[PDB]
Amino acid sequence: HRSPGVFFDSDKGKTHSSGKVLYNARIIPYRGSWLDFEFDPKDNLYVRID
DNA sequence: TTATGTAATACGTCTGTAACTTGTTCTTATGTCTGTTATGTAGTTAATATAATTGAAGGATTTTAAGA
Numbered sequence: 621h622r623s624p625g626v627f628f629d630s631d632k633g634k635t636h637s638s639g640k641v642l643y644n645a646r647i648i649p650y651r652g653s654w655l656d657f658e659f660d661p662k663d664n665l666y667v668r669i670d
Numbered sequence: 671t672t673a674t675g676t677a678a679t680a681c682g683t684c685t686g687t688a689a690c691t692t693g694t695t696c697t698t699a700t701g702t703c704t705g706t707t708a709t710g711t712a713g714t715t716a717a718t719a720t721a722a723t724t725g726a727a728g729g730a731t732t733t734t735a736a737g738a
Contacts, residue, residue, distance in 0.1 A: 670726080
């Protein structure tokens with residue numbers, strides 16, 4: 621499985637019309653809720669909870 | 671020649687078998703009534719107590735309605 625902790629990933633420029641590689645961070649515990657922090661194509665940082 | 675008397679032979683026939691049928695008589699299987707016990711239903715309890723719940727997770731593409 622995936623080790624608990626924080627993983628920093630990117631979409632490799634395959635989502636938006638332009639390249640615009642978008643970066644996100646995901647924290648996963650052994651037990652509990654997930655947290656996500658993404659970048660949008662407008663260069664603003666957003667949060668997702670579960 | 672012809673009466674006579676035996677003998678073959680064909681037909682009734684008296685009786686022994688068997689089929690058709692009923693009486694009735696006894697036995698048994700079944701349907702029903704009744705009494706008793708277990709099952710199924712229902713109502714009530716009065717320190718006080720006053721916004722769940724449990725997960726779940728590397729998807730990748732299309733098409734089509736709402737929002738602006």
